[PDB]
Every structure is written in C-alpha cells, then in structure tokens.
C-alpha cells in the first residue's frame, strides 16, 4: 500500500526556507534604496505574477519609504519595469536554490529501492520549472514525473495536478500516494485529492527559517515555533507532520500498520 | 466588529494643539500692528472662512488698537485682504504642521497589523488638505483614504464624508467603524454618521495646549483642564474619551466585549 509519494519543490525538496522568489523581490526594491523584510516579501507568495509587485507596492510602510526616496508614489510603469525584471532576475537566480535539501538525498534513493514511485506538484510554472528541475537533476534529484499549474485547469489548492502524477506513475486508489509539502496550501491539496497529507517543518515556508538561523535559534524558541507550524498544518489537513525528512519513511509503515481510513 | 478607524486631520493625527490656522491669523494682525493672542485667534475654528477674520475684527479690544494704529476701524477691504493672504501664508506653513504625534505612528503601524483599515475626514479643504497630506507622507502617515468638504455636499456636522470612507474602504455597517476626533464637531460628525465616536484630549483644539505647556503645567492644573475637555466631548455624544493615542485600541476590545448598541 502507498506505491508513490508526491513531493513538492521549494521548501520540501529544494531551497530551504523557500527564499528564491523572495530575494528577487527584495533586490528589485533595494535596487531603489527601499529595503523590505523577507517577512513582507512573502504574504502574496503563491501567485507570483505582477500583482504582488503591486500588492507589495500598496503596502503601508512600503508606499511610505518609496515616496520618501523618489519624492512620489509608484507609477504604473513602476510596477512594470520592476516585474519585467522579476522574471528576468528570478529565472537567473532559481538555479542558485535548486540543491536537494540536505539529507533529502538518502530518503529518495531509499524510497525507490523499496519500490516507491516519485512524483511532484508545484506553484511555479513550466518556464520557472524548466530552470529549477534542470539544475536539480544535474545536482542529484529528479522525480519520475513533474507537473506545474500550467498542465491543469487550476492551481495548488485543487487536486488536479495530483490526479496527473497518478495517471503517469500509474497508481489506482489515491490512498496509495503520499503528499508532502511545507505550506497550508499543500495540505489543502493532499486533503483534497484524497491522499495522505504530511507537512515538513524544518525548512518550510511557514516556519520561514534559514538553514543556520535554525541553529542560532535557542532550544526553547525553535521548538516553540515548530509547534506553531505543526498546529497550523494539522487543522488545514495534515494526517501527519514532520520536522525533518528522515521521518517520512517512518510515516509510511505507520499508515499501513495504523489501519485508519481517509474520508 | 471594528473593521476600520476614521481619523481627523488637524488635532488628532498631526498638529499637537492645532495651531496651524492660529499661528497665521495672529501673524496677519501682527504684521499690520495690532497683535493678538492665539486664544483670541480661535473662538470659532471649523469656520476658517473669511468671516472668521471678520469676527476677530468686530471683537472689542481688537477693534480698539488698529483704530489706535490705523486711526480708523477695519473695512470690508482690510478683511478681504487679510483673508486673501491668510490661506496664502497657510499654504507654506501647513507643511510645517503636518507631521504625526508620535504614538500615531506606532498605533497606525499596529491596527494595520491586525488588519484594520484607516480612513479620514476633515474641515480643511481640498487644496488645504493637499500639501498637508504630501508632507504627512514624507513624514510617516499615509491613511488608506482621504475626504474633504469638497467631495461631499456639506461639512463636518453631516455624516457625508464618513459615508465616503465606507464605500472606499468597503466596510459596510457604519457601526463597524470608529470615529476619532479632537473637538465638539468631530463628535457631532461621528454620532451623526452612526459610528463609534471617540475624542482625544492631549494635543487637541479643545485643550489648546502645547507639547511643552502640557509638560510645564501643574499636576492638578492640567488634570482640571482635561476634565473640562472630557465633560465637553461626552456632552456632545462622544461614546468614549481617550487622553492620548495608545488607549485607542483598548477601546476597541472594550467596545467588542461590552455588547452595546449605537443609537
Ligand atoms: Mg514549497
Ligand atoms: Mg481637528
């Protein structure tokens, strides 16, 4: 039972903290003496098109600074000539954060030797993925199949992308697959398809921490923050939640032994 | 319940004391020889129109003097020349009085943090409000929307301006909005609008003090002065009466928990 795991990308498989799409947004602004927090950088994370450089331009403290350095408010060609260079700088920065998240290696190798198929879904796009994947493979990671919002009629909340990793990999009931992510949207995806939804923490978008900024965080505050993530996953779906990745091949057995049904 | 807060523009957010008009009325008179006090400068205020200078004209003591300088009493021309310059010196000084009152920043910083909208209304006019807004932005205060007596068929006594904020901010039931002010008129407006009215004291017109006078005033003296303002506001429908700005939020908790109804 459970013949395939449907992983995610930045936050799950690669790019710790899911900063790729962020850093870009920061430079675009910082390149005009604005300076913004990665904290504000997220917010409209899903849906990375121009409207985000418009929602980030309509933000309080943001509109302020901007109007203080240029002595005026963002123009229409300001959002443009900014997004035009978002895609640009991003497609050229994505490969910087395409390394398989430490230890994810062994997990995949292992899960295959045990006869498990590996698929995936993402928020990014074909063009965005044609850059991400490529680097990943040259770097050791390459699932058996991949799907982006471009392949289906809708994005991440819906199960559509997941119903295709199925067709390809060829796996009858949905209960035979596991969904793994790092965002409430992901849990909503798995607990929609009819799959087993699990949330990763240490390196997730939610916990939004850096692969080091987690070591400097003190023993009591980290765990303190981890639970916050965990709890937020659980209610949005998540049949299980894990901190690291080594704990997934521990969840599968459980699923099987446990003997609980997905309704 | 409290989705948005509608702030006043001169007495609540900026000008701690509301001396912009005052320190301009007494200059037009101090430039012609007849000096006057800021106390006399502000009998009626929401009427910054021409007949305000005319009221300081037919004011005994001030009628005296001027006659003992120009050897004659004011004329219809002496007035429509002091006003036809009142606003001209106003637009040049208003920027000097268009910066926040400390707390306003931190508070407005928050509020938006809990996702609360921020609109406004004023007695100042379109042109007057202009410049002020611009300078307020460069300083650290950019409410979501702004309305002036020019956008509606009337002034402050009437709700009109407040109704405009609702459409814009998209917060429908009036009673789901707070109305902060600094004078008897601001309360008349909020009550007529049908929202939760609140009046501030420290740094208001009804207290005509300075952010140096309030620090150089007796402990008992000041307290007495405030009570006059307080009793004043309440006497005009002010559902609440805050001293400074922090406590504006505790008021929201109170209102949301005291299961009370307006009108
Ligand atoms: Mg991700
Ligand atoms: Mg006022």
Q: Which of B47, B78, B97 is the last residue of a domain?
A: B97
| A5 three-class SS | strand
- Looking at the structure, do residues B65 and B116 belong to the same domain, yes or no? no
Residue B248 counted as domain residue: yes
How many other CB atoms are there within 10 angstroms of residue B256's CB atom? 11
Q: Which of B57, B74, B97 is the last residue of a domain?
A: B97
CA-to-CA distance for A143 and B239, rounded, in angstroms?
63
| A58 three-class SS | coil
* Residues B177, B3 contacting (CB under 8 angstroms): yes
CA-to-CA distance for B234 and B199, rounded, in angstroms?
9
- Looking at the structure, do residues A245 and A155 belong to the same domain, yes or no? yes
Residue A125 counted as domain residue: yes
Q: Which of A1, A31, A43, A49 is catalytic?
A: A49
Residue B214 counted as domain residue: yes
Q: Which of B97, B114, B147 is the last residue of a domain?
A: B97
- Looking at the structure, do residues A131 and A208 belong to the same domain, yes or no? yes
Alpha-helical (H) ranges within chain A are 20-30, 38-41, 60-69, 76-79, 84-91, 104-113, 126-138, 160-169, 184-193, 219-236, 251-258
Edge-to-edge strand ranges of the sheet holding B196-200 = B117-120, B4-7, B177-181, B196-200, B240-242
Is there a binding annotation on residue A144?
no
How many other CB atoms are there within 10 angstroms of residue A163's CB atom? 14
CA-to-CA distance for B173 and B158, rounded, in angstroms?
17
Of B109, B112, B138, the CB nearest to A67: B138
Element (H or E) spanning A142, and its range?
none
Ligand at shortest distance from the CA of B183: 2
For the record, the structure tokens of A214 come out as 């987690």
CA-to-CA distance for B232 and A243, rounded, in angstroms?
59
Residue B262 counted as domain residue: no
Q: Is A78 a catalytic residue?
A: no
10 Å CB burial of residue A221 (0-12, 13-18, 19+) is exposed
- Looking at the structure, do residues A86 and A108 belong to the same domain, yes or no? no
User: Which domain CATH number covers B188?
Assistant: 3.40.50.1000
| A235 three-class SS | helix
- Looking at the structure, do residues B125 and B248 belong to the same domain, yes or no? yes
Residue A263 counted as domain residue: no
Method: X-ray
For the record, the structure tokens of B143 come out as 């409410």
Of B44, B38, B39, the closest CA to residue B26 belongs to: B38
| A240 three-class SS | strand
Max CA-CA distance within chain B?
65
Which whole-number Å values give the CA distances from A81 to A19, A75, A166, B113, B151, in the listed order? 22, 10, 40, 29, 34
- Looking at the structure, do residues B40 and B63 belong to the same domain, yes or no? yes
- Looking at the structure, do residues A199 and A83 belong to the same domain, yes or no? no
Q: Which residues of B touch A61 (CB under 8 A)?
A: 109
Quote the ligand 1 centre to A237 CA distance (angstroms). 16
- Looking at the structure, do residues B179 and B247 belong to the same domain, yes or no? yes
Dihedral over alpha carbons B87, B90, B92, B97 (to 10 degrees): -160
How many other CB atoms are there within 10 angstroms of residue A83's CB atom? 19
Q: Is B144 a catalytic residue?
A: no
CA B242 to chain centre: 15
B253: CB partners within 8 A, 6+ apart: none
A88: CB partners within 8 A, 6+ apart: none
Quote the ligand 2 centre to B221 CA distance (angstroms). 24
Residue B27 counted as domain residue: yes
Residue B261 counted as domain residue: no
CA-to-CA distance for A122 and A45, rounded, in angstroms?
13
What's the domain range around B3? 1-19+98-256
Is any Cβ of chain A less than 8 angstroms from the Cβ of B137? yes
For the record, the structure tokens of B144 come out as 């979501």
Quote the ligand 2 centre to A244 CA distance (angstroms). 57
CB contact under 8 A, B142 and A67: yes
How many other CB atoms are there within 10 angstroms of residue A250's CB atom? 10
Partners of residue A58 on adjacent β-strands? none
| Angle, CA of A127, A129 and A131, to the nearest 5° | 80
Residue B263 counted as domain residue: no
Partners of residue B5 on adjacent β-strands? B118, B178
Q: Resolution of the coordinates in A? A: 2.8
- Looking at the structure, do residues A14 and A43 belong to the same domain, yes or no? no
Ligand at shortest distance from the CA of A204: 1
- Looking at the structure, do residues B84 and B209 belong to the same domain, yes or no? no
| A90 three-class SS | helix
- Number of independent structural domains in chain A: 2
A170: CB partners within 8 A, 6+ apart: none
* Residues A104, A13 contacting (CB under 8 angstroms): yes
For the record, the structure tokens of A236 come out as 């949005």
**DSSP notation for chain B:** ---EEEE-STTTTS-SS--TTHHHHHHHTTTTT----HHHHTSS-S--SHHHHTTTTSSTTTSTTTTTTSSS---HHHHTTTSTTHHHHHTTTGGGG-S--SHHHHHHHTTTTTT-EEEE--SS-HHHHHHHHHHHHHHT---S----TTTSSS-TTSSHHHHHHHHHHT--SGGGEEEEESSHHHHHHHHHHTSEEEEE-TTSGGGT--TTTSSSS-HHHHHHHHHHHHHHHHHTT-SEEESSSTTHHHHHHHHHHTT----
Is there a binding annotation on residue A78?
no
- Looking at the structure, do residues B150 and B75 belong to the same domain, yes or no? no
- Looking at the structure, do residues A133 and A249 belong to the same domain, yes or no? yes
* Residues A124, A132 contacting (CB under 8 angstroms): yes
User: Which domain CATH number covers B90?
Assistant: 1.10.150.240
Is there a binding annotation on residue B78?
no
CA-to-CA distance for A123 and A104, rounded, in angstroms?
20
């Amino acid at each position: 039972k459970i013949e395939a795991v449907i992983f995610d990308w930045a936050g799950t498989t690669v790019d710790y903290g899911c900063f790729a799409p962020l850093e870009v947004f920061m430079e675009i602004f910082h390149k005009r003496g604005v300076a913004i927090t990665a904290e504000e950088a997220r917010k409209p994370m899903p849906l990375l098109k121009i409207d985000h450089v418009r929602a980030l331009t309509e933000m309080p403290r943001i509109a302020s600074e901007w109007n203080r350095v240029f002595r005026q408010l963002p123009t229409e060609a300001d959002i443009q000539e900014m997004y035009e260079e978002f895609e640009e700088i991003l497609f050229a920065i994505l490969p910087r954060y395409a390394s398989p998240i430490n230890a994810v290696k062994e997990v995949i190798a292992s899960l295959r030797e045990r006869g498990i198929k590996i698929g995936s879904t993402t928020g990014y796009t074909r063009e965005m993925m044609d850059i991400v994947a490529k680097e990943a493979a040259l770097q050791g990671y390459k699932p058996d199949f991949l799907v982006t919002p471009d392949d289906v009629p809708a994005g991440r909340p819906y199960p559509w992308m997941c119903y295709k990793n199925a067709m390809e990999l060829g796996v009858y009931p949905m209960n035979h697959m596991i969904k793994v992510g790092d965002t409430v949207s992901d849990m909503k995806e798995g607990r929609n398809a009819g799959m087993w939804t699990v949330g990763v923490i240490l390196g997730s978008s939610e916990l939004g921490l850096t692969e080091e900024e987690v070591e400097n965080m003190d023993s009591v505050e980290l765990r303190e923050k981890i639970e916050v993530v965990r709890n937020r996953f659980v209610e949005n779906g998540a049949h299980f939640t894990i901190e690291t990745m080594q704990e997934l091949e521990s969840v599968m057995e459980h699923i099987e032994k446990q003997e609980l049904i997905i309704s």
